[PDB]
Structure 1
Amino acid sequence: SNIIKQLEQEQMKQDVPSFRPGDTVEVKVWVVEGSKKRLQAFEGVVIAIRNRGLHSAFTVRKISNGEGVERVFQTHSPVVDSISVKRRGAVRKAKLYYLRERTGKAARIKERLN
């Protein structure tokens, strides 16, 4: 516990920016592209956050080619290179699972602006 807490926080990123459910987020991820290693962008809406120290995670949801793609990131993974908020969204819930039944015009999210 202390031992574990101590093992876990020496592995934790220090500069995770603040973001919240409904925000539009761009995550830059390290990938091996054939024989290259590059950053690849993945942009979408944060529909779920799991706050849990080192095991923190978050689910980003986007539309590719008419169909939805959801990516669960482990926030502290070295695979995740950076996170940046592209727009601040206004929602009430913590978990936006209802957006999965919505498409295009129905799935929009107002801007927070404050």
Structure 2
Amino acid sequence: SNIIKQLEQEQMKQDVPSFRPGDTVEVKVWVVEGSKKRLQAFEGVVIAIRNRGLHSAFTVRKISNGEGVERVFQTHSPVVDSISVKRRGAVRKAKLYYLRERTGKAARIKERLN
């Protein structure tokens, strides 16, 4: 409908950086620690992108200290602040759910460098 599209397009931000799934994407997200407002960092590998317009989201899989940490992020949410692509991954599949079982040497992928 035009009503739903008009209500969504007035809220979507117009400075979304375009990135393919597989890129080493570092996202800085706001967090409220009570009386503090800190911009924290989260650097990992994007394994899924669900485009839904305003409802769009993207996963950033990170291998932290110990086991892996998978965390989704809404694109047009005010809680996130910056999205910076570090490396350009050259996978040929939209979803990268097979990387969950792979740890260590088998987790890395190809660089585009086109």
TM-score, length-scaled by structure 2: 0.97
Whole-Å separation in 2 of the counterparts to 1:96 and 1:47: 5
* 1:12-71 Cα deviation digits (max 9, x unpaired): 010110111110001110001242101000110010001111001000000111201011
Local SS of the residue matching 1:101: coil
Q: Provide the aligned C-alpha RMSD in A.
A: 0.8
Indicate the residue corresponding to 2:60 in structure 1. Answer: 60
Gaps of 5+ in 1: none
Gaps of 5+ in 2: none
* 1:52-110 Cα deviation digits (max 9, x unpaired): 11001000000111201011111000001110101000101100000001001010111
Local SS of the residue matching 2:3: helix
Local SS of the residue matching 1:5: helix
- Percentage of pairs with the same residue: 100
Whole-Å separation in 1 of the counterparts to 2:34 and 2:64: 22
Indicate the residue corresponding to 1:86 in structure 2. Answer: 86
Whole-Å separation in 2 of the counterparts to 1:102 and 1:3: 45
Number of residue pairs matched by the alignment: 114
Whole-Å separation in 1 of the counterparts to 2:13 and 2:32: 22
TM-score, length-scaled by structure 1: 0.97
